[PDB]
Structures are given as C-alpha cells and as structure tokens.
Symmetry: C2
Subunit: 333 residues, 2 copies
C-alpha cells in the first residue's frame, strides 16, 4: 500500500447501505439474519469486535474471523476447518462482495456485515457500523449494556473522534506508508503533537469524553493496542514507545484490563498481519518476537481519576468460548 | 579476514609507531570504528594520530569522503577508501572496512583489524598517551577482559547483526534469544558493579558501549531486536548513560549519521530508505546514579578535555539542548 515519493492517501470507497431498526435500506435488524466478518489484525474491525462484545450482541449477530495473512485478493478464512467460513461456506471474503456486486472493483475490507441467507455483503462502512450497533440494535442489547453514543455527547464524541482519526488512527498509516522522507516527517510531527494533546486531556480526565467509556475510547484503543507491537517499529512511529508515555500508557492499560477490550486482542495475529502482508515495507517478512507484553497487566491507577466505566451499566461476562484468544497469542499469565 | 599487519613500538611488521606518520580512517556510523574513536580520544592520541571521517552513505564500493570539502579526504586526497586498499593490494578482493589505519606518505592501508587496533593503542602507543590516560587493558585484568569481551562479541556486538540480517524467521528467533539472554546476564553483573571488569573503565566497557549507543536508534527497530528498548532496561540503561556522559564517549557519538547509515544503506531490509525521526535522545543526559556503586572511571588518571574542533559532533546531530 506504498506509493513511492508520495504521501499515503486512503481510498474511502465504502458500501454505505445500512442495517437499521426501521429497515430503511431494505435491511432491518433481526437476530440470526446477519453475520459480522472481522479479523483480529485490523484495527477497524477490532472496534466492531469490542462494541459487539460490550453490548452483548454475540448471541444475535454471528461472527466470522479471517486469518492475518492473504494474497492480492484480501481476506481469507484460513484459520478455519476446511479453509472456509463455517456459516457462509466461502474460502475468501471477496466472494461475498462478488455475490452482491458482480465484478466489485473497490477494496475488499473488514469489518464487513454479510446477510446469511443470501451470502451478500450489506455494508463495510466501519464508522457507521459501530454507531449502528449502539443505535439500531438497541432492542437486543444485554441488560447493563452502556451508552457508547448517547445523544447528549455525540457532538463532543464526533469532534474528538475526527481529530483522532486523521491525526492518530490514520496518522500511523500516513507515516508507515509514506513514500518519502518528507511525507513521513510531516506525519510524524502531526502524530506526536496529537498524542501530547491527548496526554494533556487524559491527565485531566479518566476517559476521552465525559464520565464513561464511549465510542471515542474504543476508536483510540484499537490504535494504542497496536502501537508498540507494530506501529513503533514497522511504521517507524518512534519518538518513544507507548510504555514510555506515562498517561497514555496508563489510559491504555485501564481499557485493556476492562472486559471486552483486552480479551478481543490477539497480538500474534496483529504482528503476523502487518509484518508478513506488508512485504513492500518489510520484505524479509520476519516477525519480531518482541515486545514483552506483560506490562499490559500492570496497575494503572486511573481509578484515582474517578469515572464510571459502564455508567449505571455492568461489565460484560467473559467471551463465548470460540471467541477467546488462545493463551499463547495473548499476554503470558 | 582482515589485514593483520601491526603498528607496534618495536616496529616488528615494518610499521613503527611515530607521530604524524599514520592516519586513522573511521565513520561515526560503524560501531567497530566508533571504538577506535573513543579509545583514541581517552588516551589523548589526537595530536599524534590524524583522523579522517567517512560519510554514512555509499555505493557497493563502501566508504566515501563525501562530508568533506571536494568530496575527498583532506590529507589523503582520495574520494573513496577503496583507493587506499588498492594502493597496497592492487586487486584487493576482501571487505573495504572501517576502521582502517593508513600510512600517510604512502597512501596505503596498514591494518583494519579492529580488535587488535584498539589493544595496540593502549599497549604500543603508550609513549604518546597524555598524562592521566587510563589503563584500558592492564596485564593483571586481560584474562577477565578477554573472556567477558568474547561473550559480548558473539552474543551482543554481533548478536544484533545476526538478528537484522537473519534470512529466516527461525534464524532470527535464535539470534533474538541469545541476545536477550546475554543482556540479562549482563544486567545481573552490572547491578552490583559499576563497570564490567573491576574498578575502572576498560576495553570491555568500550566494546559494549558502541552497541548500546546504537540500540534504540537502530537495532531495536531496524534489526527488530525488540523485547524492549534500552531505556526500559533499568541497570543497562543507567550503565549506558554513565558511559555516555563520561568524556570521550558521548562526544564521539553522532546519532544522525548512525541512523542515516543503517536505514539508507540497508535497502534490502528497509527499501523505503526512510530514516525514522525518533527516538527522542534527551533521556541520555538524565541522571543515572551509578556513582553510588563506587568505582573510579579513570583510576588514578584524568578525564580527557573536550574534542579538538574538527572532531566535535555538530549540535543538530547530537542530543538537543
């Protein structure tokens, strides 16, 4: 994904169709009807996983997981018996996009939500997808699900999240995929200015917006989770490691240790994906054995800043057994 | 395989020590050469052994003098170091390496055997040491220095190369383990003890320092030696900063040219040839509290003064103030 001598500019051609309570676009919410396709590697998809997990939608929206590696045709189901998705029965996700738009020319991405009976991709617009879990699937939330996107905060959530998106979520990509020293230099500065900006903010406050975990924290978390494991070396975002940024590190560990976050995070598949798939940046395709992950489970003292994580909700229980991250792929006990 | 000819007090190989006769060629980038620089600097040999510096970047013909007026070495007058090896061995087929010591009048490489070169500064140039030069390789410690240094060489100095240049995951994995086992071994040792061997800075500390100096800037990312950054290894980091802040060490260290060399020359590992702008170097100048462990750095010697003016590291290339 690197254009030589050029800044990395992302191609945002998504399928914007929505799954909604009223069924406006021809796709009403109902249990057993749709299936979420994701990968532990990709941070956009990893939000979907966390959100689904926080709202208890496991029993009503099925989940398929792609393997971290693949060729030019994008995600495949190579971790699975048969090399095919248990439910959809396809070997690669492109078939699901094909079934809807024969010849689909745009990017074949995760997360994607597929309608089961038809085998067709409904949507892959990951920012709208996570909102729609909070707003449209509201009838099937578990008791104690939180308000990740309550009306009275959306303005603030939206302004913070756009900042983070451009400067951080995508900031890291804009560094790593930079095709020139100068492009890279510019990204590096914007990235670390922002992180300082966010350090100041979170010194003052347990979470990004208000009193509670919200959609903003989730979006930020998927990037910090990948920082030391990938972005720091692979993408050369290397002013300093995350673990050397006192407040952001503490914030990160607070979220990681919060149920529904760290339990969605597979460090082996994350590394494998970046270091092996991006052969243009790392042609040896050797995956670093570091970093040592144990520091993630160390005490953060963010409780001392107050807040209620779930805010008159409850933490979810542990994941269903097929969605648990293998112990060897997680932090060592 | 090196050129094993020696420059020696007795002149055994036809190359006696004398001032003004030889010139050391080095590069700020290469850690083998960087020892040379430190040692020369600790023993006050600046005024009697001249110094040329190569630029960090070059073609398949190795080191060039492209930081210098004219694109040539001030004294030798050559554009690339290969010429100096050529003038001695006209087909020279082996590696064109720094550090190299060149005899000025003739323009020929005398030696590039870097482990022997630094010993020979301590032992053979002894008559031209400044007052207060230390004993980096005293007879009564050599055994211990030698055994420690060999361990460090294979597991660490050369450990990092074996990771970065590994041609397979498994090769890499093996190098990674040996590397970090050793660094733990050394952490244990330096917890109780201010320096590696005995009471004093010695040849061992110098050899270890050139590698730690490059760890966070290069080896950690570029070579993927990434269990943890140096700055997260409490004792080794404190040891490293103690040496860095010791005159003759940090003042020989150019972080810009180090990074430039690894990240640009090794296109096979890093084909964008983009040089990271990190890490932030300021932590190097922070307090280490190793004085509490006792020791005398120079051991009835004195620290050297600051470097001669053409040997100072440009401020922009060093740590920021």
């Amino acid at each position: 994904y690197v254009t030589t001598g050029q800044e990395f500019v992302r191609d945002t051609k998504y399928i914007e169709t929505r799954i909604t309570a009223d069924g406006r676009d021809g796709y009403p919410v109902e249990p057993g009807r749709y299936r979420l396709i994701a990968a532990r590697a990709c941070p956009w998809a990893n939000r979907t996983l966390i959100v689904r997990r926080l709202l208890g939608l496991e029993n009503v929206l099925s989940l398929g997981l792609c393997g971290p590696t693949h060729d030019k045709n994008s995600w495949t189901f190579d971790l699975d018996p048969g090399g095919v998705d248990p439910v959809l029965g396809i070997p690669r996700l492109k078939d699901a996009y094909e079934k809807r738009f024969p010849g689909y020319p745009k990017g074949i991405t995760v997360p994607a939500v597929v309608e089961i009976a038809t085998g067709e991709v409904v949507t892959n617009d990951f920012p709208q997808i996570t909102i729609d879990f909070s707003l449209e699937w509201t009838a099937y939330h578990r008791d104690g699900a939180p308000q990740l996107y309550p009306e009275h905060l959306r303005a603030e959530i939206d302004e913070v999240s756009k900042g983070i998106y451009t400067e951080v979520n995508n900031g890291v990509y804009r560094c790593g995929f930079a095709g020139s020293q100068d492009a890279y230099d510019a990204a590096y500065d914007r990235l670390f200015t922002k992180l300082d900006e966010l350090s100041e903010r979170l010194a003052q406050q347990r979470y990004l917006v208000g009193d509670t975990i919200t959609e903003a924290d989730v979006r930020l978390f998927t990037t910090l989770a990948r920082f030391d494991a990938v972005y720091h070396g692979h993408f050369k975002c290397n002013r300093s490691k995350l673990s050397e940024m006192p407040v952001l590190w503490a914030y990160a560990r607070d979220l990681f240790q919060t149920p529904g976050f760290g339990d969605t995070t597979d460090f082996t598949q994350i590394k494998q994906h970046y270091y092996i798939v991006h052969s243009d940046i790392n042609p040896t395709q050797i995956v670093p054995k570091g970093p040592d992950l144990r520091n993630w489970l160390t005490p953060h003292h963010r409780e001392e800043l107050g807040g209620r994580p779930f805010g008159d909700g409850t933490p979810p229980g542990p994941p269903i057994a097929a969605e648990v991250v293998p112990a060897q792929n997680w932090v060592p006990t």
